[PDB]
């Protein structure tokens, strides 16, 4: 009675929609890491991250990792709608050795690495409205070159800025030209940032240098979806409750397995 315990060791693929991000994290699938290209525009009721997951692309550091991770988790969808920004005066589709797609240089499939064009990089100013009723999530980045010669050779600007503003929030990032530890043959880094454009709001990009432009918006979908870091196998069965240690019967009133439950689950009780 009371506590359930009695874990099974497997997560049932029914009735909830389960997605096994084998080798792939949600943030990695959101950005477009080459080994996660099979997750594009896919939905889920519960997304399971693995401890074996890794990143095999440009080195990124998300400042507020938990919130952006929790944002896409609740929507339960990676539906990406392409928009056509007028990036006039610059060159797009910048590739590097780290992000190798089909044995060829590439980049994040959801990002656009704007660089110099004809040795001229003007002050870009683009705006896109949220005419639609669903809130838009724009994912952008800021490149941190290794040396000043790189900052000049990519952007022809001694320094750059990136300002992403809305009716309610204005986000400004200033590049930090430094020599971070070498990862995948690169000493530079890129900082991922997010901005939600509510209906009736506009997105203002004021970037004067080192802009990792977004290729479109994502869909904030009202849903009961969420995520759970677990290394348990996803077996074929039906179980209404799900824990990181395996599916759990919801018949007993309380659970002592873990404070991480999804769906109709007995509330948690401590072990001791």
């Amino acid at each position: 009675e009371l506590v359930q315990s009695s874990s099974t060791g497997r997560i049932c693929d029914s009735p909830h929609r389960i997605l096994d991000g084998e080798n792939c994290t949600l943030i990695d699938a959101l950005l477009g890491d080459p080994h996660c290209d099979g997750f594009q525009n896919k939905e889920w009721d519960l997304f399971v991250e693995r401890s074996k997951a890794y990143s095999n692309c440009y080195p990124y550091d998300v400042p507020d990792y938990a919130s952006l991770r929790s944002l896409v988790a609740s929507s339960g969808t990676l539906e990406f709608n392409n928009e056509s920004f007028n990036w006039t005066g610059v060159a797009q589709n910048g590739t590097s050795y780290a992000c190798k797609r089909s044995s060829i240089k590439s980049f994040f499939s959801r990002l656009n690495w704007l660089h110099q064009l004809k040795y001229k990089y003007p002050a870009l100013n683009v705006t896109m409205p949220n005419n639609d009723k669903f809130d838009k999530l724009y994912i952008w980045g800021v490149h941190h070159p290794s040396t000043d010669s790189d900052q000049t050779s990519i952007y022809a600007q001694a320094s750059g800025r990136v300002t992403v503003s809305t009716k309610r929030s204005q986000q400004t990032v200033i590049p930090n030209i430094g020599s971070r530890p070498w990862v995948r043959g690169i000493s530079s880094r890129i900082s991922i940032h997010w901005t939600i454009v509510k209906p009736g709001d506009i997105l203002l990009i004021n970037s004067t240098g080192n802009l990792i432009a977004p290729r479109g918006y994502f869909k904030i979908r009202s849903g009961k979806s969420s995520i759970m870091r677990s290394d348990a196998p996803i077996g074929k069965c039906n179980s209404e409750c799900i824990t990181p240690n395996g599916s759990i019967p919801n018949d007993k009133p309380f659970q002592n397995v873990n404070r991480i439950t999804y769906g109709a689950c007995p509330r948690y009780v401590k072990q001791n």
Partner: antibody
Framework: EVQLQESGPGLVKPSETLSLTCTVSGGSISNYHWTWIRQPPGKGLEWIGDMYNSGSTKYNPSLKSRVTISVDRSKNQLSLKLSSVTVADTAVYYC?????????????????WGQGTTVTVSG | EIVLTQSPATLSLSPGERATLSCRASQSVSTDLAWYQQKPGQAPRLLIYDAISRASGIPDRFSGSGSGTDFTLTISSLEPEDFAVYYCQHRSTWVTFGGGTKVEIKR
């Protein structure tokens, strides 16, 4: 428009030092990476060296002890210096700019490439 | 050191035909090769960079391809103003050029 013009002699007797100056008009010389390339008669193109934005220089290993590429701000000129001139150095020398991004692995470009001071090495 | 060898040494093709120029390399290079056109008595002109990407002014008739060891350049509809010696260049750790292939339009 960034434009280049090679200025140099027409004959350099052997054992001397070749001096070639590349003057650039319509651009900033401290910015942009540059490189020197020579074309021996009927032999093809060969890389001499290159100076980058950082001022650091990199020369072809076969011709390191004799090559020196310098720049003179307040003159906006690129100076190539090839010591101990032999007749193998008889070529058409060219100064060119490169679109290199050292560090990010972006090696793509030759763009502006010059005119070509023909240098004959003989007594 | 990496060495580039172009084949064939000389191509003779009538106008409107298609040109195919190869640049086999000694070691793996990846998409780090560029093609150049040197008109007689003139400048080499950058045609293709990063094996496939075309530069400014370079029309669509020029189309390079390749990835490691073997790289090729394809000139569609050879026009009389294409007579030049074409070179391939690699650029990493050091700079190495090719032997050159002379294309001769045939009237």
């Amino acid at each position: 428009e960034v434009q280049l013009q090679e200025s140099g002699p027409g004959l350099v007797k052997p054992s001397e030092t070749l001096s070639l100056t590349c003057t650039v008009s319509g651009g900033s010389i401290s910015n942009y990476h540059w490189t020197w390339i020579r074309q021996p008669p009927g032999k093809g193109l060969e890389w001499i060296g290159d100076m980058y934005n950082s001022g650091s220089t990199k020369y072809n290993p076969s011709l390191k002890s004799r090559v020196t590429i310098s720049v003179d701000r307040s003159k906006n000129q690129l100076s190539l210096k090839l010591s101990s001139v032999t007749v193998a150095d008889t070529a058409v020398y060219y100064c060119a700019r490169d679109d290199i991004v050292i560090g990010e692995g972006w090696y793509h470009g030759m763009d502006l490439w010059g005119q070509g001071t023909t240098v004959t090495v003989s007594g | 050191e990496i060495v580039l060898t172009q084949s064939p040494a000389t191509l003779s093709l009538s106008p409107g035909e298609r040109a195919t120029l190869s640049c086999r390399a000694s070691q793996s290079v990846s998409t780090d090769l560029a093609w150049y056109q040197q008109k007689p008595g003139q400048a080499p002109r950058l045609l293709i960079y990063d094996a496939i990407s075309r530069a400014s002014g370079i029309p669509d008739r020029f189309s390079g391809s390749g990835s490691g060891t073997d790289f090729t350049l394809t000139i569609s509809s050879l026009e009389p103003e294409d007579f030049a010696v074409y070179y391939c260049q690699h650029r990493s750790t050091w700079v190495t050029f090719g032997g050159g292939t002379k294309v001769e339009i045939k009237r």
